[PDB]
Design an enzyme around this catalytic site. Structure first.
Site, PDB file in Angstrom:
ATOM      1  N   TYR A 159       7.888  -4.463   7.172  1.00  0.00           N
ATOM      2  CA  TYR A 159       6.978  -4.050   6.134  1.00  0.00           C
ATOM      3  C   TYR A 159       7.508  -4.470   4.773  1.00  0.00           C
ATOM      4  CZ  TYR A 159       4.417  -0.823   2.708  1.00  0.00           C
ATOM      5  OH  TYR A 159       3.871  -0.277   1.691  1.00  0.00           O
ATOM      6  N   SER A 160       8.930  -4.101   4.511  1.00  0.00           N
ATOM      7  CA  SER A 160       9.684  -4.370   3.286  1.00  0.00           C
ATOM      8  C   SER A 160       9.649  -6.072   3.141  1.00  0.00           C
ATOM      9  CB  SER A 160      11.063  -3.940   3.268  1.00  0.00           C
ATOM     10  OG  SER A 160      11.648  -4.234   2.087  1.00  0.00           O
ATOM     11  N   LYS A 163       6.324  -7.216   1.775  1.00  0.00           N
ATOM     12  CA  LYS A 163       5.984  -6.650   0.495  1.00  0.00           C
ATOM     13  C   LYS A 163       6.904  -7.458  -0.636  1.00  0.00           C
ATOM     14  CE  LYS A 163       2.601  -3.717   1.156  1.00  0.00           C
ATOM     15  NZ  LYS A 163       1.294  -4.050   0.754  1.00  0.00           N
ATOM     16  N   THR A 196      -1.591   9.706   2.126  1.00  0.00           N
ATOM     17  CA  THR A 196      -2.810   9.044   3.027  1.00  0.00           C
ATOM     18  C   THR A 196      -2.422   9.450   4.613  1.00  0.00           C
ATOM     19  OG1 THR A 196      -3.138   6.814   1.680  1.00  0.00           O
ATOM     20  CG2 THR A 196      -3.078   7.071   4.224  1.00  0.00           C
TER      21      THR A 196
HETATM   22  C1  LIG Z   1       4.798   2.864   5.863  1.00  0.00           C
HETATM   23  C2  LIG Z   1       3.796   3.809   5.351  1.00  0.00           C
HETATM   24  C3  LIG Z   1       4.371   5.193   5.878  1.00  0.00           C
HETATM   25  C4  LIG Z   1       3.929   3.999   3.763  1.00  0.00           C
HETATM   26  S1  LIG Z   1       5.550   4.410   2.865  1.00  0.00           S
HETATM   27  C5  LIG Z   1       5.134   3.017   2.021  1.00  0.00           C
HETATM   28  N1  LIG Z   1       6.171   2.609   1.099  1.00  0.00           N
HETATM   29  C6  LIG Z   1       7.456   3.256   0.766  1.00  0.00           C
HETATM   30  C7  LIG Z   1       7.070   4.079  -0.352  1.00  0.00           C
HETATM   31  C8  LIG Z   1       8.160   4.903  -0.619  1.00  0.00           C
HETATM   32  C9  LIG Z   1       9.489   4.919   0.106  1.00  0.00           C
HETATM   33  C10 LIG Z   1       9.548   4.041   1.341  1.00  0.00           C
HETATM   34  C11 LIG Z   1       8.444   3.413   1.436  1.00  0.00           C
HETATM   35  F1  LIG Z   1       8.363   2.407   2.447  1.00  0.00           F
HETATM   36  N2  LIG Z   1       4.141   2.113   2.373  1.00  0.00           N
HETATM   37  C12 LIG Z   1       3.330   2.789   3.042  1.00  0.00           C
HETATM   38  O1  LIG Z   1       2.171   2.134   3.670  1.00  0.00           O
END
Ligand SMILES: CC(C)[C@H]1SC(Nc2ccccc2F)=NC1=O
Ligand SMILES: NC(=O)C1=CN([C@@H]2O[C@H](COP(=O)(O)OP(=O)(O)OC[C@H]3O[C@@H](n4cnc5c(N)ncnc54)[C@H](OP(=O)(O)O)[C@@H]3O)[C@@H](O)[C@H]2O)C=CC1
Ligand SMILES: NC(=O)C1=CN([C@@H]2O[C@H](COP(=O)(O)OP(=O)(O)OC[C@H]3O[C@@H](n4cnc5c(N)ncnc54)[C@H](OP(=O)(O)O)[C@@H]3O)[C@@H](O)[C@H]2O)C=CC1
Ligand SMILES: CC(C)[C@H]1SC(Nc2ccccc2F)=NC1=O
EC number: 1.1.1.146
Lengths: 259, 255
Positions: A159-160, A163, A196
């Protein structure tokens, strides 16, 4: 530059991943502002529920088109079909992401590739397809990112990566449009944990912290795209918002602006 | 740092048929390390291996192939391991060919950059981890200033280098929590004197190119010392401003 709800009215906007969460909330906020909206996601039914609700809120127009952003062909066709449905496009809000859960990384390259394709690659495809219409109306592109797109965080490696990729790509393009005198703004939204339903189910256990209200978040993203800001920061912790900025990078890019 | 650290270590160097990777292979050779190099050019890898033996490498082999092929990537590490009898250090250095151009609609280059510059690094790491855990080894990821700051004409490239940061920095966090004693070193490089880079920026980028020989040495040292990040640029101002103190503070606080 002071934000005004009036700024959005005869504005035609697209919102991806709007069947729920932040995307859903943005749709409603936009509808309350009486703008034209085309929401998308995969689930057809849940999308019908948001469209109808938008009209009730005062949406000048509310349509939807279901499909998966894993398929780049649909990504392209969507922007075209969405464009003709409202006869234009003044703001592109990229918000969708592939299903993501918190786990240590081991050997799931499938999830890493899927994340790069859905979370990053499709945003690029979507951008290429909408740029023309955006140039015409001097539109704005809003890219929804995360704190994990500016800083490293365990359990969300794939995910990171996606982004971070968005920051690198869109920030580099912003500089290209500056010299190529392209009147399209790019807003990178760095969000912290939001309340969410999907986020909550995946967070209880790892990300121990306060979750900001999704309704406020969705509005902050919108106001940022309207003010054509390069970036928006929204988190429940003021101490995080205080350290999240990186002045050194801003200075270095200035010193480098003088290729 | 002590050259004895690599004295007889098993090392993989990708993108080593030329440029920085090639210089790293030679440095490792002069240090008595076992080395397996890879790239697409068979003819050229043959020459590098030859020189490596000449320089005093404890052992040197090559395996040609394209990192656009994830199956080859996976199989490459297993065969590289068999060649040296294990693995101590994985140096991910290769990148898909990239020239300076504005971004229009070359979706092909964007995906290929992500596939070769980032995804192949993950595939490679997954395949090497078992052997790296056996020796408390190290992973060295080669990046760029364009992987820490934005820059025009290299959008696709920058996107892939940023991705490496997000991914490998997150994994490093997981490893410290999971007791995985494998170090991860991200190398932030400024403009380097390689043949391909010098020709790609000609008449476009006006910055002093640092020597590839010295660059290759620092990457090795940083990997040997298990440093999380290596910053190497000819300018003192770039070296300072490329760091992100706010991120270090914020992350330490979170952990
Ligand atoms: C992965 C999901 C639970 C949520 S959490 C997120 N970003 C995020 C925000 C704060 C800390 C760590 C993170 F990774 N983005 C999402 O869509
Ligand atoms: N919630 C949080 O704490 C945080 C969220 N963010 C960011 O906010 C944005 C939205 O997150 P959030 O509201 O929580 O997410 P949700 O899971 O609530 O909504 C995600 C949306 O994406 C759609 N979607 C999922 N898979 C695909 C495909 N394939 C195509 N569409 C798809 C879903 O609809 P459907 O399944 O019907 O296709 C849904 O509308 C993301 O870009 C995220 O990274 C950032 C920081 C924190
Ligand atoms: N040189 C510079 O100015 C800078 C370099 N860097 C980083 O340093 C690293 C080395 O760059 P540099 O030495 O200049 O690059 P080079 O062009 O000199 O070498 C690239 C290597 O990658 C291999 N390669 C290319 N495509 C594929 C595949 N597909 C598989 N292997 C492939 C090439 O061999 P072959 O064609 O035979 O496959 C060659 O060995 C990269 O990670 C780069 O991003 C960072 C900042 C600046
Ligand atoms: C893209 C290529 C010509 C070279 S140049 C580079 N990184 C880099 C360094 C300095 C400025 C801009 C950059 F993008 N990385 C490479 O491999």
């Amino acid at each position: 530059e002071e934000f005004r709800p009036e700024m959005l009215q005869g504005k035609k906007v697209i919102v991806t991943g709007a069947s729920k969460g932040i995307g859903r909330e943005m749709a409603y906020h936009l509808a309350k502002m009486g703008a034209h909206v085309v929401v998308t996601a995969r689930s057809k039914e849940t999308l019908q529920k948001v469209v109808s609700h938008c009209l009730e809120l005062g949406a000048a127009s509310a349509h939807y088109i279901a499909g998966t952003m894993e398929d780049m062909t649909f990504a392209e066709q969507f922007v075209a079909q969405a464009g003709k449905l409202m006869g234009g496009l003044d703001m592109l809000i990229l918000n969708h992401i592939t299903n993501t859960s918190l786990n240590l990384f081991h050997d799931d390259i499938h999830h890493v590739r899927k994340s790069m394709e859905v979370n990053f690659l499709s945003y690029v495809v979507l951008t290429v397809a909408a740029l023309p219409m955006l140039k015409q109306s001097n539109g704005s592109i809003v890219v929804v990112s995360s704190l994990a797109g500016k800083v490293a965080y365990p359990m969300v490696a794939a995910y990171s990566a996606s982004k971070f990729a968005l920051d690198g790509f869109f920030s580099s393009i912003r500089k290209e449009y500056s010299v190529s005198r392209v009147n399209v703004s790019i807003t990178l939204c760095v969000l912290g944990l939001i309340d969410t339903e999907t986020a909550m189910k995946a967070v209880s256990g790892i990300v121990h912290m306060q979750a900001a209200p999704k309704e406020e978040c969705a509005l902050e993203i919108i106001k940022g795209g309207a003010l054509r800001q390069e970036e928006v920061y929204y988190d429940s912790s003021l101490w995080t918002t205080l350290l999240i900025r990186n002045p050194s990078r801003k200075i270095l890019e200035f010193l480098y602006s003088t290729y």
